[PDB]
Paper text:
Cytoplasmic incompatibility (CI) results when Wolbachia bacteria-infected male insects mate with uninfected females, leading to embryonic lethality. CI is caused by linked pairs of Wolbachia genes called CI factors (CifA and CifB). Protein-binding experiments and expression of cif genes in yeast have shown that CifA binds its cognate CifB specifically and rescues CifB-induced yeast growth defects. CidBwMel consists of a region, which is predicted to contain two PD-(D/E)XK (pseudo) nuclease domains (residue 1-751; hereafter CidBwMelND1-ND2, ND: nuclease domain) and a C-terminal deubiquitylase (DUB) domain.
Residue numbers in the entry:
A (entry chain A): 2 to 151, 161 to 642, 649 to 746, 750 to 759
B (entry chain B): 4 to 272, 280 to 421
Write the structure that this text describes.
């Protein structure tokens, strides 16, 4: 990069230079702002930056740094101890009168954010330990606030200088907690606490309850640590991580373990561990093109990153799993599994064509062996859903793989909570349909034989019942009924399969039932052999569910058109129009059966369709292209952050003589009636213009200088297939990338 | 892979028995490479179907030292039945990858006809039978192609005929396909005057910065069938770091005997050296890595470490490798692994005292080269043995104390 460095600008008091350098780092960690309020993620992140700056030759030795974690403590409104805090850092240099103080927390109104009187005295006490001849009259305190909170906004503030006692606050966060514990009343206000008297012993204890710690450079310089990781040789990357780099990170963490672990309960080890590692990487963000992919969702603790100068095409991805309770050798197994399937989970494989990765299990809490390292090859993301559905009938563990296939391809931007239950259900059912309805391959039996599959979808009589029912009939082989229903969609009955032409005498009927429970996990019951076909049809004559079985039309022509679309005809509008004419032709017979009820349903169906077809090689749903930043004796710098996301992104695989990935982007909207159609096309076309303002996000994903973008509106109330999917009629679809 | 894949791998490895434990350990790694290739064909085999493979790998005729005989193996794997046990494998895929050209077309014709018979006669009433049969052949070949790009290599899609390949044409194609058995097959079809040249071409083409584990068995076969290894070095030296790439990939797959042969030819028979200080250090640390991953082969890994480390051509590299600077030393990813190998308790080793002797000598060498840095060397080694986890390391045991005990032993 071309910045001055985050810590360098901050210490110099260059608030504008720090702002531009920080938004450049945010471009490098696109998920950073999702977790700025999770525990002490942000304070530990900034502490790690300050604690490794000297070793990185960012700060000089005479630029002494002092810090403390000002933990928020008990919440006066529920009595529970919080796990958040304010980080307070001061920099002092002998000979310079200005002492810059920084208060870092997610919110500018966070409790006790300002430096307190006792914090000033504890800091001066620490400064005097190295400078015994200190004259406090010659010290000029410059106090700052650095905050970022959720849209998302980040604020850098130069506080106004206050006179007399108002120069510093009455209490820090931990002081208020100390006194609330001392008085055994967590609901006491600051004004009430001020009224209470303290004996000489209590005031002495309160004064030493706050104390600063000097950050001291170690015996190892880390200037060239990112050079070790900017490599295309997995053995070199593994050796550098196993030795210098991960030894330094864990040992530096150990040097401040007492300040990190003490005076806080319910500490979020997960988010603090990731924040600590990110602060180390951020000290190089101004000199290297580092891509950091963070998955800190519930039940996930992954960080995958790639280190390069800028143009390198085959540098080694590094995949880390941060454990807090399990030993790091188990975390290494999780990191190896995450790295093997990196094409599913991460955007990192878009920035490198390396087939080798380095995986790391790391747990900062362990004193012995806090990390383990290995290498593993990168596998292709090509899961055959219908084939595995037939295989899971007689084989263990395949149900878990089927479940993982559906869940792992959900968009990361949709949280898996009860508030978004219908969003998750629309995505799973739509993706499962697109995969199964557009897979052109026959069934491969275990014995040396192959059979074509006729696919059906069942339209339940109750249009409110949330259940995707599909039937897969392989010729001369068994029949599989697939159910994916909501938690309140349980039924008692059988699907009538009389419409099927069963010629074999050994044809069985199987049932694979999936349920998305209230906790948004996908339970797949054991497959049930419902007996012989004619035996199954004899029974259940009085137990057949109400509804209709619709046959899925042939979709072989979509794969051929997709081949021409992603390759030679990716900039030809007529070729894209023909592709969606054929998708409309395949969907119109069953449109009201599959029920395209939401934008998520429409997007997920196309996601499964494009995934199953050989072309495109890669398709990403709700792909974040980047973000936009808007700027809005006290100096307040406030920046609003707006994300640009692509509903669908299609990409080729880079070849040796064809580095252009032909990036194709689709903006998808759904119109329920004619009145919404014009307003959905307008919103989709306006979203296109917002994407055309982003250039730096598209540059690393292709070697060319063009990106194709098309607005697509699903017309739910269309009466013929020709108007089901609305494509622009008749320029404006080739976004010229300005690399200048 | 999948959990089931690890189970079938262990089952097939348990069948390997041999008096020489070095031979048995090498054959188990060959089974691992075979499984990693053909896991898609055996992933769901129960013990009744797995017995066919048990008897195949129990046949000594299927082996040549620690490597599988692809000529004998490809024969047995294409048999319909061996001694009252039916072959459970999809035999078209076996005959394709093993280049059993006498059976590829008949086996495919069987699958083509039974698959063609499952379509209704009135399914596609716009196509002719010529177009119908070609569509069925393309659908079938595209279906088998999911298991690998090499499985449509032998069937012409226009005629359904067995494809014909020139010896040179097929050799270059199988190298690009990273197809071990096809490379060896087309090698034996080459004219004698071209054998050495084509093998060298495959080596320099695969010894590249982003080689993968699958490339190692091909590199091993090519090196083993090259007569003039001195000429091979000269051709490899025409490409930057070509010598490092070849040895590095071979080391990761535990082809120790092949690496030792290359080290003896190129380093033991001016000031120009065939690889750099970094290549030197990465050889030793990668050997130390696989030493811990494969305890049954730790003797061979240790010998290779000492051959490279103590080679007189790299005496300057050896001294630099024990130079403690910036609170680190390159040998820590070698000395530490050796201490862990010497101390591991999950194995029954006969020569632990020789292992301790090498460790003490390595420490004494580091102390002799830089006496004024030895205190930092000890500090660095203890820290590395406490922070960096390794395979074979006893969990919860302070290995820094083991380093302290060794340093105290040398006064």
């Amino acid at each position: 990069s071309n910045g001055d460095g985050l810590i360098r600008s901050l210490v110099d008091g260059d608030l504008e230079g720090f702002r531009q350098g920080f938004e450049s780092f945010l471009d490098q960690c696109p998920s950073f702002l999702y977790h700025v309020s999770a525990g002490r993620f942000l304070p530990v992140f900034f502490f790690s930056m300050f604690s490794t700056a000297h070793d990185a030759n960012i700060l000089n030795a005479n630029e002494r740094v002092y810090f403390r974690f000002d933990n928020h403590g008990v919440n006066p409104r529920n009595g529970e101890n919080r796990n958040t805090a304010n980080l307070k850092v001061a920099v002092y240099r002998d000979g310079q009168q200005v002492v810059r103080c920084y208060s870092i927390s997610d919110r500018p109104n966070s409790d006790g954010l300002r430096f307190s009187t006792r914090e000033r005295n504890a800091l001066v006490q620490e400064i005097r330990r190295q400078n015994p001849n200190l004259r406090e009259e010659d010290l000029n305190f410059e106090q700052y606030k650095v905050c970022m909170h959720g849209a998302t906004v980040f604020e850098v503030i130069r506080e106004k200088d206050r006179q007399g006692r108002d120069k510093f606050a009455k209490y820090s966060a931990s002081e208020v907690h100390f006194l609330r514990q001392l008085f055994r009343n967590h609901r006491l206000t600051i004004k009430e606490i001020e009224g209470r008297q303290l004996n000489q012993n209590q005031l002495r204890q309160l004064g030493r309850s706050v104390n600063f710690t000097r950050v001291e450079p170690g015996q190892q310089r880390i200037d060239n640590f990112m050079e070790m990781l900017a490599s295309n040789q997995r053995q070199d990357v593994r050796d550098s991580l196993r030795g210098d780099i991960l030894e330094y990170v864990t040992d530096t963490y150990n040097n401040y373990r007492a300040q990190i672990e003490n005076n806080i309960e319910g500490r979020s080890q997960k988010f603090e561990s990731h924040g600590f590692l990110l602060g180390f990487l951020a000290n190089f963000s101004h000199r290297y093109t580092i891509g950091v992919d963070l998955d800190l969702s519930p039940r996930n603790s992954h960080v995958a990153f790639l280190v390069r100068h800028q143009v390198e095409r085959e540098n080694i991805p590094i995949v880390i799993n941060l454990a807090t309770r399990a030993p790091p050798y188990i975390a290494l197994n999780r990191a190896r599994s995450h790295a093997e399937r990196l094409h599913v989970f991460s955007f990192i494989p878009i920035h490198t064509e390396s087939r080798n990765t380095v995986c790391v299990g790391l747990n900062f809490n362990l004193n012995l062996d806090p990390f383990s390292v290995d290498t593993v090859g990168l596998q292709q993301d090509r899961f055959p859903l219908v084939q595995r559905l037939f295989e899971c009938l007689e084989n263990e563990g395949i149900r878990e793989n089927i479940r993982d296939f559906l869940l792992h391809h959900l968009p990361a931007e949709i949280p898996r909570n009860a508030e978004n239950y219908d969003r998750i259900f629309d995505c799973i059912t739509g993706f499962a349909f697109g995969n199964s309805a557009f897979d052109r391959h026959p069934l491969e039996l275990e014995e040396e034989d192959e059979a074509p599959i006729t696919k059906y979808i069942f339209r339940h009589g109750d249009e409110g019942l949330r259940c995707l029912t599909m039937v897969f009939h392989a010729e001369g082989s068994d029949i599989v009924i697939l159910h994916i229903r909501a938690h309140d969609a349980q039924q008692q009955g059988a699907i009538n399969l009389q419409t099927l032409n069963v010629n074999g005498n050994d044809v069985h009927v199987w049932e694979v039932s999936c349920t998305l429970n209230n906790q948004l996990e996908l339970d797949i019951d054991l497959p049930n052999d419902l007996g012989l076909y004619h035996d199954y049809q004899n029974n259940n004559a009085n137990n057949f569910l109400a509804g209709d079985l619709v046959q899925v039309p042939n979709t072989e022509n979509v794969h051929n058109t997709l081949n021409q679309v992603v390759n030679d005809g990716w900039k030809n509008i007529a070729q894209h129009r023909g592709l969606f004419q054929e998708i409309s032709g395949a969907l119109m017979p069953l449109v009201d059966t599959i029920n395209v009820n939401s934008e998520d349903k429409f997007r997920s169906i196309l996601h499964g369709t494009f995934y199953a077809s050989d072309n495109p090689y890669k398709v990403l749903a709700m792909y974040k292209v980047g973000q936009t930043y808007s700027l809005k004796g006290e100096r307040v710098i406030l920046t609003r952050i707006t994300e640009q996301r692509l509903d669908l992104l299609l990409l080729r695989q880079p070849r040796e003589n064809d580095l252009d990935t032909h990036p194709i982007g689709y903006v998808l909207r759904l119109a329920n009636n004619a009145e919404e159609v014009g307003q959905q096309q307008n919103d989709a076309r306006q979203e296109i213009g917002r994407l055309k303002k982003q250039h730096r996000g598209f540059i690393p994903i292709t070697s060319g200088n063009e990106v194709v973008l098309f607005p697509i509106v699903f017309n739910r109330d269309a009466h013929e297939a020709g108007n089901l999917i609305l494509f622009p009629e008749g320029e404006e679809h080739v976004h010229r990338l300005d690399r200048h | 892979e999948t959990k089931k894949q690890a189970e079938v791998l262990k089952k097939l490895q348990d069948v390997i028995k041999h008096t020489d434990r070095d031979i048995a350990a090498g054959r188990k790694l060959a089974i691992k490479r075979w499984v990693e290739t053909y896991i898609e064909y055996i992933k769901y085999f129960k013990d009744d179907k797995l017995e066919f493979l048990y008897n195949v790998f129990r046949d000594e005729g299927c082996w040549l030292g620690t490597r599988l005989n692809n000529t004998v193996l490809g024969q047995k794997l294409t048999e319909e039945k061996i001694g009252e046990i039916d072959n459970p494998l999809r035999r078209y895929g076996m005959a394709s990858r093993y280049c059993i050209t006498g059976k590829i077309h008949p086996l495919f014709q069987k699958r083509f006809e039974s698959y063609r018979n499952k379509f209704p006669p009135g399914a596609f009433d716009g196509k002719t039978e010529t177009e119908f049969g070609k569509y069925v052949r393309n659908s079938l070949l595209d279906s088998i192609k999911r298991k690998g790009p090499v499985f449509d290599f032998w069937i012409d899609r226009e005629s359904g005929e067995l494809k014909k390949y020139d010896a040179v044409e097929g050799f270059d194609s199988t190298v690009k396909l990273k197809w071990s058995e096809g490379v060896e097959y087309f090698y034996n079809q080459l004219e004698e005057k071209d054998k050495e040249k084509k093998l060298t071409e495959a080596i320099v083409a695969l010894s590249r910065p982003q080689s993968v584990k699958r490339d190692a068995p091909i590199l091993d076969f090519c090196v083993r069938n090259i007569g003039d290894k001195d000429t091979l070095l000269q051709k490899l030296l025409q490409k930057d770091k070509g010598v490092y790439f070849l040895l590095a990939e071979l080391i990761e797959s535990c082809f120790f005997d092949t690496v030792h042969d290359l080290v003896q030819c190129w380093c033991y028979k001016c000031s120009d050296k065939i690889f750099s200080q970094r290549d030197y250090e990465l050889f030793l640390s990668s050997l130390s890595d696989v030493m811990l991953k494969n305890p049954e082969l730790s003797v061979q890994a240790r010998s290779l470490i000492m051959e490279i480390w103590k080679c007189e051509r790299f005496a300057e590299y050896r001294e630099t490798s024990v130079n403690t600077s910036n609170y680190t030393v390159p040998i820590k990813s070698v000395l530490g692994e050796l201490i862990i190998n010497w101390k591991r308790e999950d194995v029954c080793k006969p020569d632990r005292e020789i292992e301790k002797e090498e460790i003490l000598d390595m420490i004494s060498f580091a102390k002799g080269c830089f006496p004024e840095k030895f205190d930092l060397f000890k500090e660095v080694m203890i820290r590395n043995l406490r922070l960096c986890g390794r395979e074979g390391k006893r969990k919860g045991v302070d290995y820094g104390k083991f380093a302290e005990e060794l340093f105290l032993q040398l006064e």
